[PDB]
Each structure stands twice: as structure tokens, then as C-alpha cells.
Amino acid sequence: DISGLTPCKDSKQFAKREKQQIKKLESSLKLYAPESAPALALNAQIEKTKRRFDNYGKYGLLCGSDGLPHLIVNGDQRHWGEFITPGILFLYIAGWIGWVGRSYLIAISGEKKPAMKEIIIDVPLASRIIFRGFIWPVAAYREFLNGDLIAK
Amino acid sequence: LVDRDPIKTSFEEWAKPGHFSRTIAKGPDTTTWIWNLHADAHDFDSHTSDLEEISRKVFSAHFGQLSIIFLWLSGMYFHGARFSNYEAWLSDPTHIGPSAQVVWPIVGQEILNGDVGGGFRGIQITSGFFQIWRASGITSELQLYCTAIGALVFAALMLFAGWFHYHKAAPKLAWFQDVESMLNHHLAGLLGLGSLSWAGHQVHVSLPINQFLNAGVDPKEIPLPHEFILNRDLLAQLYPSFAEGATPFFTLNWSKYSEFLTFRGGLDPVTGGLWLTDIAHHHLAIAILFLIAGHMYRTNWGIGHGIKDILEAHKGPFTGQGHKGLYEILTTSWHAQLSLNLAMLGSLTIIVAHHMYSMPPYPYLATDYATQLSLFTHHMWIGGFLIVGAAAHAAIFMVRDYDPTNRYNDLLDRVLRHRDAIISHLNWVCIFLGFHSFGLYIHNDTMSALGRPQDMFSDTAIQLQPVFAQWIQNTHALAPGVTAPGETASTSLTWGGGELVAVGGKVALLPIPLGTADFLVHHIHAFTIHVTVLILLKGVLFARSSRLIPDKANLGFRFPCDGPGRGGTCQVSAWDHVFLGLFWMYNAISVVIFHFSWKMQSDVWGSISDQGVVTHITGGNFAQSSITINGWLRDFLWAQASQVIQSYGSSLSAYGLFFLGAHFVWAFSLMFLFSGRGYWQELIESIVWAHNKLKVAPATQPRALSIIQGRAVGVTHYLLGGIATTWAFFLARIIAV
Amino acid sequence: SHSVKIYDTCIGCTQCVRACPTDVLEMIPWDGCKAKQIASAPRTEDCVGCKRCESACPTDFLSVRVYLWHETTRSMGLAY
Amino acid sequence: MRDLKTYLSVAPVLSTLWFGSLAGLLIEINRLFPDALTFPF
Amino acid sequence: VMLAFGTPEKQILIEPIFAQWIQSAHGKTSYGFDVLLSSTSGPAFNAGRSIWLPGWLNAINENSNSLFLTIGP
Ligand code: CLA
Ligand code: CLA
Ligand code: CLA
């Protein structure tokens, strides 16, 4: 129990929140005929709410005294899916985007009028460069070793 | 007079941005080029100096505007046919809230599809289209679908006309300068014939269908509109005078048409709106008047007036040559005409906003409070913006098209030779009004805080009665039978006749009393309007020269300053006077709409019981609480904002989100208004340094925004945030209650 | 009166002396540039401090400089 | 048309196409897998 | 936005773990970290347990004052 927290599946306030949300959704359904489309939409909403609460219960989250999930970002292995894995994925994607942009900027620097290639993009060259960023960590690290990453 | 194929239709110019300007076509050395591209896009005068080319360009863009408007109307009509509860609302207008928009369930946003009645879930609309369609006799969705299709076809036609009249047959300059023919056609044909056609539609369609609806008939059991035309027996049953045909019209026996052409006045008790027979008679008379008025100006047949001849004959001992020379100025300058038309259109919009609330023209509109409030506020804002644009383009004309060597006019010359007296007098009037209007509120606040309520300007201690407006109200209330014998009731219920109209347990309209608070708020309105007129007129009158900068006309219309000399010259151009008057227009319109909202919720709107006792929304606290600033802060802003701050978790949560978003946008504008360019240009230099280090420096050198661009961004964000905040507050408050 | 100074990086373009809204600046002969000219500032008691001259100078950094100083009736542009 | 292809490569049109496709992809991703608070795999 | 749509359980709420650990290291026992001064068998606890720790621990574990208030997201 990190920081005095409790698992979601044992939390009574979590169940009370679920019951309140479902009861609020159900009071609107009594205003419509069961065959009507709004009744179908409300049924789908209720099912989705139940599924969301069940999924939050399954993943091993931690609740406070208010029955709301809390995130642990200290690096504990039991909660790596909360912060670590999405962080690594985001870092990979952002590095991809930055590397592709830098490669395109370097590619057109030697032209007669490099400015005109920035307002009117050269589509084939960018398309050829787009795929190359999939391996950006290796290329960036090898460029850092060779000393070509930093301008002299 | 046209030219055959003046400009080739090609995609070549699409690939060369800035082709309209020599400077912009060179290329983007810095990022200022991109901003310069958009600011000068529609300034056709700077592109070319030929008046014929400018006229040809102007004529074609209005076709695109008409096409966009037709597309918007087509969308509005289509959404009512497919995604609305109009047919359910038509059977019970008083218990069902109109709705014409639905939302896809994606990220939990389906909560916005709250209930509105009639087995429908969607967003409640406040544009008033349902009442417009009901007053036209529309019953089913097939008619709305047909109207949407027709509007789409008309949009396509407008687009084709816009292409044609620029690329295939462009009219010559002599065609544009025919003002007599244009005035004759726009008076007799555009307005008179349109009014006559609408009167015919109201006579043959709206009256019988609306009579059937008011009688209580199921909308699906009402005969179709064409059945009233092919079967004259039905109309004869509804109106016996239709059995005589058009014979009374041609024999001058017009009194026989009194059944469907009345002069009643007041409101219809069943629906709470104006009688439709009065509207039909009004449109008929207006059509006649406009048809007669369109035969005044001379054309190819010698009979009529010459506008130049009329202008040249109006001169006096105080004005010298008078209006001589004004005909040549108004036929060679597009900016002066634009300024005049903008001012007139803004004034007309404000008049329309004032008139539609006191004489509700649509059925079941007075008892729909949200629609009334929304329409009033919308049209007030539109009128204010147009009025400011008028002064902007007047200043543009003064800077550019003023040339006394070939376009001399004595009236304009005499105004420029005593501008100091005008500006000084307006300054004194503004100071006097500000002291004697806002000072009375501070006196009240101090006296209330000190514990001396008997020394306040109020209805109980020191009365300031608006006796001039009360006299007008009394005169208008007693008009029928004395000065308007042909009328049965007064023009409006607000004059003070004493009668009350209630529709479905709600109050539609009733007399509006005037007291001490109205005096103060009206003088506040006068003060704000006078200050705005000061800033705009000073800006127009000193556009060319002053004692500070004699050569101001050589620097242009839109320049930032003339340096730190002469003690400092920031904001001397005419553009800066529009920039400063936008803030005062915002202030004035905000005060006006707050006055309208509080007065309506306090003294007019409410519910009526079986015994005949009225309970207003706020309980009539306007008279005693609005005489202090603390009252406005507490009983208006604090109390009525509880609806918008408690909207989370319900169908009104979008307004709650927009409240905070608009707060953020308003606060974000102060960064651009309080700071200057040099700091941001110095800061960018350090950021560019690290981009050079990693070889990611762009070839288009980054630049800070110009002085004018920063001013424009600040004012735009300031207005957007403020208006959006007020919009969300009003809608969230009025939909709930 | 304000202070107006000229530096020997001047190229003799004349653009500063054409821009001045009061007659403060004038051209004099010189040697040290191709044009054989330099600006001079004899009348700085009539300077208003507008900096129109500095906006017109084509040198990388200005060969004409204006330093604002004690203010008088002429330098404030007062016609009261 | 070469000029038509050039106009399709200008910055605003290309940015609009890219962002529209991106928003569509994100909307469909959140539609297939709603209410993601943790990376469970 | 999560509160607006009526689903408060979708919020991103992050515990201030480092500050809570520091508070526990001063003798607070509301988080159950049991480090340093919150540990009864630590050398740091044994060093000052006869001089100032009793009164300080009494003051820090009483919630009616403002000494090391409890913290959250
Ligand atoms: C599809 C057919 C077509 C083609 C190929 C052209 C081609 C041309 N027109 Mg043109 N025009 C057309 C239809 C067309 N027009 C129509 C239908 C109208 C009537 C509205 C006009 C009205 C018109 C005027 C008034 C002028 C031209 C001019 C020109 C020439 C230079 C401008 C230009 O292309 O810059 C690039 C232009 C664009 C990329 C177009 C941007 C304009 C926007 C997209 C209009 C759409 C309105 C709005 C933005 C959309 C909804 C509103 C909201 C979303 C904001 C060029 C040869 C100019 C000329 O010859 O001067 C030398 C000129 O002054 N046209
Ligand atoms: C019928 C009305 C009308 C017409 C035809 C014109 C026409 C003109 N005006 Mg004008 N004006 C009007 C009303 C009108 N005005 C009003 C009512 C005002 C007062 C507010 C002004 C204030 C005004 C000023 C202050 C200036 C003009 C200028 C001009 C000229 C150039 C305009 C230009 O390049 O636009 C360019 C258009 C834009 C840059 C678009 C602006 C977009 C707005 C501000 C923000 C919209 C926010 C939007 C919702 C966010 C979505 C963004 C999207 C990318 C996601 C042109 C002749 C200029 C001129 O003549 O200079 C010499 C000038 O300086 N006007
Ligand atoms: C809430 C802040 C505030 C206030 C109080 C004012 C007040 C004023 N502005 Mg203003 N303004 C503001 C914000 C404000 N502005 C903002 C944000 C902008 C946008 C940049 C502008 C832009 C602007 C322009 C462009 C102009 C003004 C002008 C004026 C003056 C109008 C003439 C007059 O006498 O009014 C009435 C004066 C008052 C209501 C202030 C007095 C307050 C009460 C009466 C207290 C009096 C105390 C009393 C004298 C005893 C005190 C003694 C002491 C020992 C305690 C007035 C002084 C105009 C001007 O110069 O005059 C024509 C003008 O042209 N303003």
C-alpha cells in the first residue's frame, strides 16, 4: 500500500461512484419508450460505464479516500504502465518527428533558394525522408559519436 | 458596356503567392512576408490604380458572399428537416424546447444530448427558426428539404455568376457610375416587388394555415397550401370577401377586404405575437410606397431628378457653396460609399434590435425568453461593429482619396478649418457626462457604506424622475381614439395601457415603468456613446495633419509612430483611433446588454398563476439594487452566475467550459497589449542561437510581430474573450430559468 | 537640445539629410569614401528627435546617431 | 496540371490534409479503445 | 474536461511521492513509508530519542496544527 492507498477493487467509494453514475443514467431512460433510439443510446452508455469501471478494477490501480484512481510515477515495477511505457513511446515518436524535420532541413540547405522549399514543400523528397526516421535512435547516436550532431 | 474575356482562367497564379503585389511576389526572406500576404489580400486599391479594374474586382466578390450566405441558409434549412424535433414542437410549442443539432458519442460528449421534449435528444437552439417556419405556414419536413435544395441551387447560380461577370463579360466603368438607374432599380424592383411578393405569400398561404393552427387543428389535418388556391370555396369559407374576387380592388371598394387587412394593433392572445393581417397590410402599403418612390431619378426618358442638380441648389449664408462637388466625390471613391453604408446599416441593425423585443412579430416568440435575449444581444453587437467600420473607412478615404485640386467641396473644407472647436467641445461634453453620470453611482455607494440611506439618489430619498420619457409613454398610451382613431389598441404593450398578455402560464409583455435607476443608466449610455464618437471623430478629422506632425498624410493611414521625438508620438495614425474606439464600443454594448437583461428579468418576465398574480424571475430588485455598483456586483453578476458555474455534469456543461476558455483567451490578450516588440525580438535571438547549434535553423529568418500586428492581435483576442464570456454566461443563465 | 553625431563609416548616400523634417543636417566634401562626401550636423538646436535620419542610413550600424537630451520648446514641437 | 500540383504542396493545404488525417486516426483509435488510463500490456 | 462530462474517474491524479517520503523521514506516520525518524530502530532515531524527539514527534503527528500538513494531487 504505497502512500496509504488502497486497490480499486476493494474500495467502497469506487463502487458508490459507479452506482451513482449508473443510477443517474437510468433515471433518464424512464422518460423514453424502450424501442426508441434514445433508449438504445442510454443502454449503450450504461454498458460502457460498467465496462470502464470493471476495466479500472482489473488493472490494479490505487484509490484514495475519495474513490478516485491515483498514479504512481516513482518508478516502481508494479506501476510501470502508468508512466514509464507511455513515456518511452512518446519519446520515440517525438524523436522521430524531430529527426525527420532536421533531416529535411539539412537536405535543402544547399539549394539556390532554400527559403522557397519551406513555403512550398518538395513532396517526393519529404516522402523519401519520412521513412528514414523509423530508426532515428541509431542514426542520432552514431552521429553524436562521429561529431556531426553539433555545428562547429 | 462590357469587355469580352479580359482575364484568362488559369491555375498559374495559384502557384505564385503574392502575385497581386510587386513587393510580395519576390519571395519570403523573413517570416514577415507570410503575415504581409494575408493583411493586404483584399486591398484592391493598392493592387492597381485603375478604377475600372477595382470596380470589376469588387463586383465579383459580392457574388461569392451571396453564395456563402445561400450555403449557410441551405444548411440551416436542411438541419431542421433531418436533425430536429420541429414536428413535435408544432403540436405543443409551450412545453417543448426547440432543438436542431445532435452530437456523435465519442469521448463522452453525448452528455450534451440532453432531453428537450417530444422524444428528442439534442442541443437546444436559440436562433428562432422554428417560429419563422411556423409563421410561414410550414408544416412538414418535405417543404424544408425542398427549400434546402433550392438554396443549394441558388448558391451554385451565384458562384457561376461571380465567375462569369469577371472572366467572360466584365462591365465597363460607365456602367458602374449610373447611380440614378441603380437607385431606381433598387427602390422599385428589389424592395417594392419583394415586399409585394411577400404580401401575396402571406395573403394566400400564411393566413389560412395559421388560422387553422390557431383554431386547434392537428397540423397533419390542415389542407395543403395549394388547395387554398385551386379551391376558392375553402378561402371563401375562411374569408367571405374572397368570393367577390378582385372586383373590389378595381372598383375602389377596398373596405370589403377588412377581414384579412386590419389595423388592430397589440398582440394575438393565443400566440402572443402580432396579428398576421396587420403584417400583410403593412407589407402591402410598404410595397406601394417603395414602388412609387422608385420613379424619382432621371434616366433615358428625360423625366425625373438629377442628383447633381439637387445637390448644387442647397447652399446657405453659413456654408458658402454648400453641397456642390459632392456628386463627383461619391461617384469616384469606393471608400466613402462604404463608410456611409456601414454607418447606416449599423444604425439600422440597432433600431431593429430595439424594435423586435417590444413588438414581437413571430408566434410564440415573446414567451421564449432565451430567443429574445439572444436576438437582442446578437444584433446589438453587429450594429456596433458596423458603426466602427464606418469610421475606419472614412479615415481611409480622408488619407487616400482626398484631393482638393480636382475634387474640391466647400462643406468638407469648412469642417477641416475649425476642427479644434469641435474636438474641444466634444471633450468638455464627455467630461461633463462622465462626472454627472458615474459620479452619482459613487455618491450612492459612499452614502450606503456610511450608513446614510436618506442621502442617496433613489426613489425613496432624492428622486431623479425621467419626466420626458414618461410624457412620451402617456402620449403613446392614449393615442388610439384621440390621435389615431383608426387604431383599436396601442402599438406596443410597453407604453402603459395597463393590459397584460399571458401565454401558457408565462408573461409575454406588459407595461414597463421608468424611475430613478433608468435615468442613471440612460445617462451612462449617453456618456459611453459620446466618448466613442469623440475617439472616432478625432481620428477621422486629424488624419492628414496636426500641430504635432504637419506632414502626417505622407506617412500613410497605417503607421505605428513618428519616433520618440516631440516628447513621443506613439499611436498618432488614424488606424490607432479605430483600435482605441473598439474598446469603448465593447464597453458601451456590454453596459447596454446588461441593462436589458436585468430589466427584463426583474420587471417583465415571469410566471402567472390562476388568481392573476405575477412572480418575476428576480422579484423586482432592479429599482433598489441597481443604483449602486455593489448592487450590480452582488445581485446581478454574483447571483446570476450560479447557473453557469454549476453546469458541470449536465447538458449545459459546454457553457461552463466556454466560460473558463473565454476567461483564458481574454487574459491572454494582455501580453500583447502591455509589452513591446524589442523585448521579443531580443528573446528570439537567443532561441535562434541553439537552433544554429543543432543545425535546425530555418532559412526563413524568424521575426517578431510588427507594432501594428501586435496591437491588432491584442484587440482581437480581448474582444473575442470578453464577448464569448458574456455569451456563455447569458445562455447558461437563461436556458435553465 | 539633442545630440546628433556622425561616424567615419558614412558612404555619402545623402539619404539622412533628405529625410530630416527640420533642416539639421547637410553634406560637406570629404575624402575617405568613393562619393567624396560626409554628413554634417550644424543645427542640432532645431532637432525634434524623430530618428527619420537613422531609418534611412544603409550602413550595417548607423553612421548617424541621435542621443536624446535636455528638452526645450523647439525640441518638444510645441506651437502653443 | 503542374501548377495544380504546386498549389497542393503549399504549406496551409498540406498542413490541413495532414492534420485532418491525423485527427481521423486519433478519433478512430479512441473509438476502438475507449477510456485508456494505463498501458496494460 | 473530465469533470465537465460527468466522469471524474478519468482524471490524471499524481501522488507527490517525494514530498510524502520527506515528511515520513521527519517522523510522520500517515503514509506508512517507515524511513529514518519514522523507523524506531534507526540510528538517527536512537541518537536524539532522549533529547528532542518525543516532543517533536508529538507535535508532528497531531493534525490540528500547521506543522507538515498532509498533501495530495
Ligand atoms: C475555379 C475557377 C476559377 C479559377 C481557375 C480562377 C482563377 C483566377 N481568378 Mg477567379 N473567381 C472565380 C473562379 C475562378 N478563378 C469565381 C467563381 C469568382 C467569383 C467569386 C472569382 C472571382 C475573382 C476575382 C474577383 C478575382 C479573381 C482573380 C483570379 C486570378 C488570380 C487570383 C488567384 O487565382 O489567386 C489565388 C486565389 C485563390 C487560391 C483563391 C482563394 C479565394 C478563396 C478561397 C475564395 C473562397 C471564399 C472563402 C474563403 C471560402 C468559404 C469562406 C470561409 C471558409 C472563410 C486567377 C487567374 C483575380 C484576378 O484576375 O486579378 C488579377 C481577381 O481579382 N477571381
Ligand atoms: C462590408 C464590410 C467591409 C468591407 C467590404 C471591408 C473591406 C476592407 N477593409 Mg474593413 N472593416 C469593416 C468592414 C468592411 N471592410 C468593419 C466593420 C471594420 C471595423 C472592425 C473594419 C476595419 C478595418 C481595418 C482596421 C482595416 C480594414 C481594411 C479593409 C480593406 C482590406 C481588408 C483586408 O485585406 O482584409 C484582410 C482580412 C483579414 C486579415 C482577416 C481577419 C480575420 C479576423 C480579424 C479574425 C477572425 C477570427 C476567426 C474566427 C478565427 C479562425 C482562424 C482560422 C485560421 C482557424 C478592405 C477594402 C484595411 C485597409 O483598408 O487598410 C488600408 C484595414 O487596415 N477594415
Ligand atoms: C476604470 C478605469 C478607467 C477610468 C476611470 C477611465 C476614465 C476616463 N477615461 Mg478612460 N480608458 C480606460 C480606463 C478608464 N478610463 C481604458 C482601459 C482604456 C483603454 C486604453 C481607456 C481609454 C480612454 C480613451 C481613449 C479616452 C478615455 C477618456 C477618459 C475620461 C473621460 C472623460 C471624463 O471626465 O470621464 C469622467 C471621469 C471619471 C468618471 C473619473 C472620475 C471618478 C470619480 C468621479 C471620482 C472623482 C473624485 C473627486 C474628483 C474627488 C477626488 C479628490 C481626491 C483628493 C480624492 C475619463 C477620465 C477620454 C478622455 O481623455 O476624456 C475625454 C478619452 O479620450 N479613456
Ligand code: CLA
Ligand atoms: C523540426 C523542427 C524543429 C526542431 C527539431 C526543434 C528543436 C528544438 N526547439 Mg524548436 N521550434 C520549431 C521547430 C523545431 N524546433 C518551430 C516551428 C517553432 C515555432 C513555433 C519552434 C519554437 C521553439 C521555441 C520557442 C523554443 C524551441 C526550442 C527547441 C529546442 C528544445 C527542444 C524542444 O522540443 O523545444 C520545444 C520546441 C517546440 C515546442 C516547438 C514546437 C514543435 C513544432 C510544432 C514542430 C514543427 C516541426 C516542423 C513542421 C518540421 C516539418 C518537417 C517536414 C518538412 C518534413 C530544440 C533544439 C527551445 C530552446 O531550446 O530554445 C532555443 C525553445 O525555447 N523551439
